[PDB]
Nucleic acid binder design. Sequence first.
RNA 1: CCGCCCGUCGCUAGUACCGAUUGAAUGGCUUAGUGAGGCCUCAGGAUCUGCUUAGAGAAGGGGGCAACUCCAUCUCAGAGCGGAGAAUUUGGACAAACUUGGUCAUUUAGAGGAACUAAAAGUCGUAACAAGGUUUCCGUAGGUGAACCUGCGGAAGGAUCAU
RNA 2: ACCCACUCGGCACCUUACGAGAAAUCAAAGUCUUUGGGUUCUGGGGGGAGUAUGGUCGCAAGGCUGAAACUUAAAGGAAUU
RNA 3: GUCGAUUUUCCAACGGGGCCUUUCCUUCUGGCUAACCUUGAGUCCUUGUGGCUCUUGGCGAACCAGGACUUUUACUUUGAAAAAAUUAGAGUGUUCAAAGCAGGCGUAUUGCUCGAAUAUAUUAGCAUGGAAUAAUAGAAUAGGACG
RNA 4: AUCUGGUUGAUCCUGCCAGUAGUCAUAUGCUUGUCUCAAAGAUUAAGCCAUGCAUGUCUAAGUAUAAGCAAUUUAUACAGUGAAACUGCGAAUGGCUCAUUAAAUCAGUUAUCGUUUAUUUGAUAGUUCCUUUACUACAUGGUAUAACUGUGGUAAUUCUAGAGCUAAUACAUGCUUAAAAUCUCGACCCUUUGGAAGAGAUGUAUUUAUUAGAUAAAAAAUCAAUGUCUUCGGACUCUUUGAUGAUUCAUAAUAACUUUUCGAAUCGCAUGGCCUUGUGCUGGCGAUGGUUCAUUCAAAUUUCUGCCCUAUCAACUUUCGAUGGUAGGAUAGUGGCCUACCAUGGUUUCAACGGGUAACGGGGAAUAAGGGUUCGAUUCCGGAGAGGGAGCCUGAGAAACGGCUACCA
RNA 5: GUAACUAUGACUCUCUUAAGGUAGCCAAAUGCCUCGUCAUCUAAUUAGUGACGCGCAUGAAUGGAUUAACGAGAUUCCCAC
Lengths: 145, 257, 122, 187
Amino acid sequence: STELTVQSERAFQKQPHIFNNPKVKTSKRTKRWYKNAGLGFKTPKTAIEGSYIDKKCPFTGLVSIRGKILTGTVVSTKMHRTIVIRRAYLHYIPKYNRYEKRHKNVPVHVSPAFRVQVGDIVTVGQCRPISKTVRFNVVKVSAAT
Amino acid sequence: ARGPKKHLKRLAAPHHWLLDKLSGCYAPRPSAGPHKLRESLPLIVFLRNRLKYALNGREVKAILMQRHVKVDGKVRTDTTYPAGFMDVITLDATNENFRLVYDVKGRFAVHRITDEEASYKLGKVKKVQLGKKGVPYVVTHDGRTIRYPDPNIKVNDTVKIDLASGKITDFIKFDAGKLVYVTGGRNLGRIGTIVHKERHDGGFDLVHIKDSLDNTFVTRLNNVFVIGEQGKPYISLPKGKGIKLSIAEERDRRRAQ
Amino acid sequence: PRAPRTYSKTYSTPKRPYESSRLDAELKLAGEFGLKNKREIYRISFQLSKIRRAARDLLTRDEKDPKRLFEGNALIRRLVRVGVLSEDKKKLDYVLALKVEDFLERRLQTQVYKLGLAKSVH
Amino acid sequence: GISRDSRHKRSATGAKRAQFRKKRKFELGRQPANTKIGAKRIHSVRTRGGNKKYRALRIETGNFSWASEGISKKTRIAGVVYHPSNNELVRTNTLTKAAIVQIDATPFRQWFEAHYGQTLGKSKNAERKWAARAASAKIESSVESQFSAGRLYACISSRPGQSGRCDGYILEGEELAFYLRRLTAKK
RNA sequence: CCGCCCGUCGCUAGUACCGAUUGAAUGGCUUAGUGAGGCCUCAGGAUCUGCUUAGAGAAGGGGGCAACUCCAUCUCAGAGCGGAGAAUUUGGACAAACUUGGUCAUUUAGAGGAACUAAAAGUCGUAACAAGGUUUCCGUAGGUGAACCUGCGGAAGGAUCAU
RNA sequence: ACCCACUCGGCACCUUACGAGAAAUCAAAGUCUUUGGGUUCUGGGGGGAGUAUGGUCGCAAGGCUGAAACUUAAAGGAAUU
RNA sequence: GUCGAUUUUCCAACGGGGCCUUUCCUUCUGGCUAACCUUGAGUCCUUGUGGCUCUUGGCGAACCAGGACUUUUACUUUGAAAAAAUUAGAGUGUUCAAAGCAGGCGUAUUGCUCGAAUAUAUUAGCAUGGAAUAAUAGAAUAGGACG
RNA sequence: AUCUGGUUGAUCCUGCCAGUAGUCAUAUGCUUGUCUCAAAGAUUAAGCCAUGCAUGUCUAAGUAUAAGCAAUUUAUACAGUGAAACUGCGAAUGGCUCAUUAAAUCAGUUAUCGUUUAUUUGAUAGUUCCUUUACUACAUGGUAUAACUGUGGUAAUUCUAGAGCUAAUACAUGCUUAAAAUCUCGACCCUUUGGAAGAGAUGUAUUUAUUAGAUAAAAAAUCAAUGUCUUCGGACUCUUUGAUGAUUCAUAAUAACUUUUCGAAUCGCAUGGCCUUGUGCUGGCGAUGGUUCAUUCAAAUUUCUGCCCUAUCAACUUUCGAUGGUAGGAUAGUGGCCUACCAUGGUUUCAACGGGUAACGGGGAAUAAGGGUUCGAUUCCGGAGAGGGAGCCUGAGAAACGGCUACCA
RNA sequence: GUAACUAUGACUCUCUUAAGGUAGCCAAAUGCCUCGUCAUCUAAUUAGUGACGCGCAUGAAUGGAUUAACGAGAUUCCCAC
C-alpha cells in the first residue's frame, strides 16, 4: 500500500529460499509461496494472486500466528504497513459496584492482502515481536460501510 | 537470578509430600531427572516419610548407596532422584515393588505390587517425530525415547514399556470408552472413563470424563492419562480406585469402623 | 528463618469496661465456679462468640446443603460430647442460645466439686 | 558493552524510563568487526554456552551456488559493486549479507564447457553425455556477457561476520535485471 | 445595660512573607570540551623456539684410514613456518571521572520593610448587639488617630408580610 | 370589542393542611434508616484566611484559582423563660 | 409399604427435554447407520398384531471429521488451572490451650491400621449454558435475499 | 450491627474536642514466681567498621618416588593409607538489605512456529589412512610445567625470580572397517529395441543454494521422450510420504563449503571361553568422557488486564531512535537493539508528560454487621544491590563484587 | 511641653506675616558634621551597591518618583585579554 511499486527499495524484494528457475519453461514464470494462517482465518485471494512481499504477513511471510486473537476499531492508518486499534473496555471497581472506560491503543501490522480505513473492526492475532511496539498481525477485517 | 537455584525452602515445597511445617527450613530439592520437580517424589521422602524405613536423611544414604532401591530396574543412588508417576521403586530386600500412583485425594500413596506386574510402566505418549536418518521415535512423560514405535502410536496415547529391555510391547489409543487416570488438576488421583473430548485449536483441548457413579468432570488432556479400557486396567489401581467420595459419605465410611 | 509458628489469643476485653450490671453478673458467675480473674469469663465468652458466628454462618444459607449439614453436625457432635448441649437439643438453634454458664459447668474443678470428695469448689 | 536491551530507550508514550538493572550480560551486543576482501583471516568468539561464532576479517574464496544449474564452485571474489544498505560498504569493499559482488567466473566456465555444452561467452562417453544433454538449455543474454567479461555478478547469502564464510547465490533472471539497473543508475 | 463588645497605640513572645546580596549548599538532568580503564580491531615482534641433515674448517672430533667406529661431533650464510609470544601502539564502540556553564527541585543565611496571631487588658475613643441612639449589611470608590465616616447601586438576615 | 358563567393549556402567585424538618417553617424544603429517576457544582469545628506564594487575565483598581505553620473548646442555627 | 434405621399409591410443589399450532438448531460427503417408514422364507405358537435366525428399495440424530459460512459486545450460570504458609474449617485428650499433623488398636514375640480433608480467593484470561436489561448494524439511487 | 462527658439560665440541633475498645504496631515507666512458644539495629545512617569466621572439595573407578606413616607375610614398574600440587567440578546456590524503581518491578494468565540450557534421565556414532604389496596403533610429542630440590630479593601482600626435575581424562597431535547400494568420470562396437573394464566419492558437524516434505472428485482424443512385456493384433496394471489450528516444521535428496567440530592413545574390579601353548584370539559388570536429538533443573525475552498523591504538572517524544518501512550489523535468539537509507509518525482530559512518595511488588496484616479503612522493611514467591558509577575476564550460568580493572568518596 | 509604658500618636497652646513640606525620594551630581550607621562586595574598600533618615540646606511642570531602548557622558565590580 505504498503504492503501485513492488520494486521500490534499494534491495531486491524476494521471497526467501523461493527460486524462479529461469531455464525451466513455466508459462506464468511467477511462484508465490503462501500458507494457512490457521484457526479458520480464510487467506484472502488478494494475498495468493498479489505481487507484494511483506515478510511480516501472516500468509506470505515467516511469522506463524500463535497466542491470542484480539479485536478493535482502527484509529490511525498514517504509517507504512502498520495501523493503531483502540480496544474499548469497561474496568469494574469493586467499591462503587461500577465501571469506567479505558482506551489501550495497540499498534498492528497490516499486510497489503487487506485494505483498512478509520473506523473498521479488525480481528488481529499475536505473533513474534515485529518492532518495538507492534506484537500483533491483522488476519480479519470488517468494514461496516 | 544469576544461575539456576539449588535449595528448596520447606514451605515452598509441593504440598502432596505432606512435609511437616516445622523441623528444618529446607525441603529435598529433587535433582533433575525423568519427572518435573513439582510432579515428582524424591527417594528421600519415599523411604523416610511414606515407608518409615529410615529415620533421617542420613540413614536413606546408607539405604541408597547399598544398591537396593531400583526406580526403573536400575540402581539409582541419588537421594533426591525425582521418582514420579508410574515408576516402580523396587526394594530387593523385603521383596517390595511399589508403583507410585496417586491416592484419590491427590498424593502418592504406597501401592505394593507383584513382580509379574512390576516389569512395565505405561508411558503416556508425548511428542512423536522423525529423528536424524529419518528414524521415527516416541518420547513418553518419563523422558524415555523409543525408536521404531508402532506407526499407529500418535500423541496422547499410552505405551507399555518392557523396563527390563526398554522397548514398547502394547499401546492404547485415546478416544471415547477408554479408562483414564487424572495426573494433576484438583481431579488429581481420580480414575474414570472418557465420554467425549473437544477440539480447542491452540486453546487447551478439554475432555469430559465420567467415573463409575455417572459423575462427569472436565479435565485437560495433558493432566489426563490413558490407563486402559473398561473392566481390565493395565495396572493395579490403589484401594479406592479414584472414585472421589464427598465429605459426608467419606466421613460415614471412616466412622462405620 | 524457617516458618511463622501460628499463635492466636483466646480472650476478649468487653467493649465498655465500667458497667454495674456486667460487673455484678461476672463477679457472680466467677464466685459460683471459683475463678481467678475476669479473663476466664472473657475467654468462655470469646469461645461462645466463635461458635455463635460459626452457627449463624451455617444457618443464614440454604437448608439440606452439604456445607450446613457437615459443619453443623460436626459442631453439635463436638458440643454434645463436651456436654454443653444434652441428648435432646441437636437442632443448630439450641446452640445459638448456649449461655457461657453451660461451658463453666463443665470445667474440671466444677466436676470434681459435683462428683463429691471436693468440699467447696475452691 | 553494546546492550540490545529495550528497558533503556524512551517508552512508546514518550516517557524516559528510569534506569534499573546495572546493564546485564544476556542483553550483550558486540562490535561489528567488518570483513574486507582478500588475504583470508578468521577470529573466533565464544558466545552463550561455548557455541563458537566465527567473525571473518579479510575473507577470500567464497562458495558460490549457480542454482539454475544446481551446482556450487569455490571462487575468488574481486570487489563489491553495489549494496542496498550503505554506499560506504562498497568503497571499503566490505563483505556482508545481500552485498552484490564480482567473482572470478572461471571454474563456472570450466564446468559448463566440460559437462554441458561448448565455450560460453561466444572420449565416447563424454560425447554421449553432450549428445544426451542435447541443448539442455541456454542463458538468456544477461549471464552470457559476464563469463567473457571475466567476472560475473553474485550476491552474498552467508552472514560472514557470524558464520565466518562468504558463500552463496550467483545472480540470474529479473534479480540480475534489477541489480543491473541499480548498478548502472549510480555507476 | 453598672450587660456585652470593636479597632489604633504601647509592653511582651511567637509564626509567616518581601528583601540588595551576580546569596550559599545539596541533588537530579544537561550544553561544549578533556577523557582513565578494560573489550573489538590495524600493526608491532623482547624473547623462547622444532625439523633445519643446512656447506662449515673439527684429524678417540664412535672400541682410531673409514660421506670418523657423524656428538645435543666444530658453527651458523641461511632458511622456510610449525610456531608460540610480552611491552608497545593504530583506530572503534562501551563509558566512568574531570572542567564548564545551563535549568529544575529541595534546604537555607540576610541589614531592613510591611505584617498576622496570642497574652494581662495598660492608653484612646465606643464601632456592633435595643430604632445601640446615624437601622444593619454586601459590592465598589474616596477620606480619616483608631474604631470608622461618606458617595453610588443593591439586600432585609428591618424597626414595615397593610390602603 | 368590553363584560358574565363553565372549561382547559401555560404564568407570576396567594389561603387553609394528614408528610418533612433542629426548629423558623413548605406547592416543595413532601414521595428519605420502608435509605437509589437523570445529572452538574459545593462543604467537613472556630480562627489564621480568601491571607501568603505560583501561575493566569487586566491600563490600573483588581479578578480567577488558593495553601500551610501556629492557635483554640467551642464558634454557630432555631426556639424558650 | 417394615424390620429406633427404609417406599407405594389416592396424591401435589419445584425446576425440565421432545412436539405442532405459519415457527426452525445453515445444512452436506463419507463413515455407522442400532435401526422399520418396510418384508426375505415367515412362524417357533392356550383361540392371540404374544415374538425374532435375520435382513431389497430409505430412514440418520447412536454417530463423528471433514467440509464451510457465521452483523459484534456487556451481563449472568457452571467448569477448568488457580503455589504453600495465612484465613475459615474437618479429624485427633499435645495433662488443657495457643499449637502440632500427629496418632489409633491388637498376639501388644513375626504386628495391623485410620489420617495429613474440604471451602473462599467475587479483577483479567480460557471454556461452558441462558439470551430478560443495555447499545450496534442489516433492504432506501436496492450494489437487498433465495434457486 | 451499642456509644457517653463538653457551647445554654434551661432546650432542641449543626458540629467538633474529649472519653471508650483493639492493634503478629513502636517506644517508655513501674512491677514480675512457674510452663509452652517466640520476634529482635527495618524507620534515623544502602553511614563507617577493628578483629575471628562465613567456599571448598577424593572414590576401587584422573595424575603419585611426600626425601610422610606404612612394614608384612600379593608387590621388582606401579597396587595400602595418606600431605602438597596439577586436573575436574563448585564457588552464579545460600544468606543479607530494601537504596533505586510508579506500566517499571509485581500478581494472575499467555507465547516461544523467536531462542540458549552445565548437570540429570533417555536414546544416539563399522564411513576419519587417501590411491591399495611389508605408513606409530601391542599405543605419538615436550613442540611443558606444577608440586618437589636448591640459589635469592623487598620492611612489607594469598609477591614470585632464576636454575634442576617429573606425570596426567592437563596441553598438542594421531591410525586401526565389514557389507551393500547409489552416484559421477571411461577400458569397450555399430549404424543399433544401440550397451561397459575400472577409478573415485557418498559418517557426523558448519555454511549456502536447489529439490522433496503429497491430495474434495469419473472419463477422453492426440503428438513426442517408446524402455521392458509383445502371450510380435498390441499390454505395461500395482507407481510412494510423519506432525500441528498454522510453518520454509521434523526429516530426507542434489551441488559443494570449512583456519574440517566429533569419533574414546582414559581408569577400577573379576580374570572367564575355545587350543592353533601364542606366554596369542575372544570376553562380563562398571567409572569417566564424548557428538547430535529429546528430557530435567533453568534462563531470556513475551500476550492480556490491574498499581499510591498531585492540573499551584496540558501538551509530551523527533540534531544525540522518537513511530513505522527496506536492507544490513549485532545477539543465544525476536526487536530501532544498533547502523545506513526512506516516510512523519507515536502518547494524551478514559489524565499523556512532569513533580512527590518517610513506595520494592505480591502471598498477606490490624480493625470487624454489611460495605470498608490503614498498613505489608520482616520467616514464602519474585525484583534489585553489595560505598557510588562504568567496564570485563573465567565459565553452562555473572556484567559476580567473601572475582579483576579504572575513575569519584 | 503632659500621658500607657519606659521613650510619647491622647490631650493642651501659639501659629512669621498665608500656609506650616503632603505623596514621594536621599549621605542622592543636593548631608556641614562625614571616612554618618547597618548589611554587602575585598585579606584589607575615605570607593561601589542595598537599606536606615529630626534631611546643616530633599520634594512635586523653579516639576517629584519610576523608566525599556539609546550614550565617544560620570562611576563600581566581574570574565577574557
